[PDB]
Design an enzyme around this catalytic site. Sequence first.
Site, PDB file in Angstrom:
ATOM      1  N   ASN A 147      -8.434  10.017  -2.489  1.00  0.00           N
ATOM      2  CA  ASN A 147      -8.833   9.171  -3.629  1.00  0.00           C
ATOM      3  C   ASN A 147      -8.262   7.770  -3.385  1.00  0.00           C
ATOM      4  OD1 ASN A 147      -8.239  11.948  -5.848  1.00  0.00           O
ATOM      5  ND2 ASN A 147     -10.234  11.220  -5.141  1.00  0.00           N
ATOM      6  N   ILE A 156      -3.079  -2.943  -3.963  1.00  0.00           N
ATOM      7  CA  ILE A 156      -3.490  -4.103  -4.734  1.00  0.00           C
ATOM      8  C   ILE A 156      -4.446  -4.854  -3.826  1.00  0.00           C
ATOM      9  CG2 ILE A 156      -2.786  -6.187  -5.921  1.00  0.00           C
ATOM     10  CD1 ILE A 156       0.089  -4.887  -5.993  1.00  0.00           C
ATOM     11  N   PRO A 183       0.791  -1.211   0.000  1.00  0.00           N
ATOM     12  CA  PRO A 183       0.000   0.000   0.000  1.00  0.00           C
ATOM     13  C   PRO A 183       0.831   1.273   0.000  1.00  0.00           C
ATOM     14  CG  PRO A 183      -1.090  -1.585   1.296  1.00  0.00           C
ATOM     15  CD  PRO A 183       0.174  -2.233   0.840  1.00  0.00           C
ATOM     16  N   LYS A 208      -1.915  -5.642   5.850  1.00  0.00           N
ATOM     17  CA  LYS A 208      -0.622  -5.967   5.242  1.00  0.00           C
ATOM     18  C   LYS A 208       0.499  -5.689   6.249  1.00  0.00           C
ATOM     19  CE  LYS A 208      -2.174  -6.466   0.618  1.00  0.00           C
ATOM     20  NZ  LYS A 208      -2.230  -7.839   0.040  1.00  0.00           N
TER      21      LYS A 208
END
Lengths: 114, 113, 114
Positions: free
Chosen positions: C97, C64, C1, C32
Amino acid sequence: PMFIVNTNVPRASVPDGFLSELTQQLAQATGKPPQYIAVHVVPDQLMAFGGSSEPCALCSLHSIGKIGGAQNRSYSKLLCGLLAERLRISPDRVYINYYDMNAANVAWNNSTFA
Amino acid sequence: PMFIVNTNVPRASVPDGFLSELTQQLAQATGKPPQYIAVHVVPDQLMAFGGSSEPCALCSLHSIGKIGGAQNRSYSKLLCGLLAERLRISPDRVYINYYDMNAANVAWNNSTF
Amino acid sequence: PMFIVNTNVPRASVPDGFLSELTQQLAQATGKPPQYIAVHVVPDQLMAFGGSSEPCALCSLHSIGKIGGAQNRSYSKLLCGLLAERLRISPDRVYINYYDMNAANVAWNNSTFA
């Protein structure tokens, strides 16, 4: 909507009132309320466009809808126009990426717009 | 195409000619002419990678086509290679996001493609 | 990330542990490990939010997977929380975003995750 400009043009060449103008124009152009318009201008950048370091800009406009073929053509005229008139940047040295954001993929105020 | 590098490496460690090199190499690699390549390098950044502040980079490459499985693999080798050799940044401290832009969503020169 | 914050708040107001904090919290929140988390903070920016230049932030989180309706809703609470407490930024002056990256479109370590 969110508009970011990255440019090698100096800070001192960015006129006072540029951010407010971008805000007002983007409101008219997108039909969205100014309270929801954010603008971001990053001058003095180490960049090149086509190998040349003459004035240029790399920009992006994010919006939830109000993004498409005709609309994007219209925004380019408007925004290249403003970068030309206020920052003295030739429009053939500007890119602007458009992003039609999904409402679930925009956070504001402890939630998303979905 | 458009390549942006953000890095905590100092401005003074960015060698003379880095932008021109990125331009030339991206041209060859993407098959697009150099005049349509833009590059942007943002040093001295406040960033961390895995909680460590050793040299790192967050990057992005935007292109109208010329983006995909094999092509992206190839660009990573090239670009991590250049960040390693020129900026002394370890490749396990680099992320690069790829964006296949639709032509209607890229402005240039008062219009779009 | 990956998390990027762009803000008009001065560099001196960004506390020295902010990047580590964002790292640790994003790790817990995304599930993660902290070694996979990158964070980037860009202060002193020339920006406006809704015409006003009071403190604000434009941010983005790329990952992801681990991106979606509910997850994004949860991250907004977490991240607005942190921007409010550490950077003294009102949460109605924050956009984030979210980007659910395909593994073929992320490079790390001479290759991609595909």
